[PDB]
Write an enzyme that holds these catalytic residues in place. Structure first.
Site, PDB file in Angstrom:
ATOM      1  N   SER A  81      71.851  39.454  53.000  1.00 56.91           N
ATOM      2  CA  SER A  81      71.830  38.923  51.638  1.00 56.91           C
ATOM      3  C   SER A  81      70.965  37.684  51.520  1.00 56.91           C
ATOM      4  CB  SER A  81      73.240  38.592  51.189  1.00 56.91           C
ATOM      5  OG  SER A  81      74.096  39.655  51.523  1.00 56.91           O
ATOM      6  N   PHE A  83      68.310  36.956  52.794  1.00 54.05           N
ATOM      7  CA  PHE A  83      66.904  37.288  52.652  1.00 54.05           C
ATOM      8  C   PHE A  83      66.574  37.940  51.323  1.00 54.05           C
ATOM      9  CE2 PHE A  83      67.190  36.371  57.006  1.00 54.05           C
ATOM     10  CZ  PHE A  83      67.995  37.284  57.673  1.00 54.05           C
ATOM     11  N   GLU A  84      67.549  38.192  50.467  1.00 57.06           N
ATOM     12  CA  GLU A  84      67.243  38.679  49.136  1.00 57.06           C
ATOM     13  C   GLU A  84      67.708  37.734  48.055  1.00 57.06           C
ATOM     14  OE1 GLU A  84      65.648  41.809  48.994  1.00 57.06           O
ATOM     15  OE2 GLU A  84      66.033  42.481  51.044  1.00 57.06           O
ATOM     16  N   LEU A  85      68.614  36.818  48.374  1.00 58.11           N
ATOM     17  CA  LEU A  85      69.028  35.807  47.419  1.00 58.11           C
ATOM     18  C   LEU A  85      67.988  34.699  47.297  1.00 58.11           C
ATOM     19  CD1 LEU A  85      71.032  33.981  45.792  1.00 58.11           C
ATOM     20  CD2 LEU A  85      71.901  33.366  48.037  1.00 58.11           C
ATOM     21  N   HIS A  90      62.472  36.746  49.780  1.00 61.41           N
ATOM     22  CA  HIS A  90      62.356  38.105  49.264  1.00 61.41           C
ATOM     23  C   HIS A  90      60.896  38.537  49.249  1.00 61.41           C
ATOM     24  CE1 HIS A  90      63.712  41.591  46.688  1.00 61.41           C
ATOM     25  NE2 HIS A  90      62.402  41.601  46.509  1.00 61.41           N
TER      26      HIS A  90
END
Length: 155
Positions: A81, A83-85, A90
């Protein structure tokens, strides 16, 4: 810049047999002793400070690879997460700006689970998927270990 890999796993104090030891013990030891790469391991190399999010961010930028160790605890805690928050992290994943080595240690039992993972794979531009087959791969000079070392940076 300053590290050959950022190492992303999950540890809890729990669904893990001998797998835990591979992802917590043998894997960072073999890459960092017996092959001499330099790893950034968050539970050595980063205090949780008030600046943790931007600390962790500015360490991924300085890492030549991102290793993601899909222990079942990782799929549990959705370890990806961070790495996408984080916005910058991202785009680095989707733009190709960071090479992701994803060490798959288990069978994705999980109808939901199996699908989130594919959007992870989807969302990473430059992905290598290396499969861990037990003690069999853990045995040094294996077929897994070679598969992994040139996916690591130059010497």
């Amino acid at each position: 810049k300053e590290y050959d890999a950022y190492l992303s796993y999950t540890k809890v104090d729990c669904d893990n047999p001998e797998e835990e030891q591979f992802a917590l013990e043998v894997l960072p030891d073999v890459l960092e002793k017996h092959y001499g790469y330099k790893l950034f391991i968050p539970e050595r190399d980063l205090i949780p400070s008030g600046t943790y999010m931007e600390d962790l961010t500015r360490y991924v930028e300085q890492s030549r690879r991102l290793i993601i160790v899909l222990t079942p605890d990782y799929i549990l805690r959705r370890g990806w997460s961070i790495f996408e928050l984080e916005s910058r992290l991202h785009n680095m994943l989707v733009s190709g700006e960071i090479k992701v080595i994803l060490i798959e240690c288990t069978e994705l039992k999980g109808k939901v689970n199996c699908q989130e993972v594919e959007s992870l794979k989807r969302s990473i531009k430059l992905l290598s998927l290396i499969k861990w087959k037990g003690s069999k791969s853990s045995k040094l000079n294996s077929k897994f270990w070679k598969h992994l070392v040139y996916e690591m940076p130059i010497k």
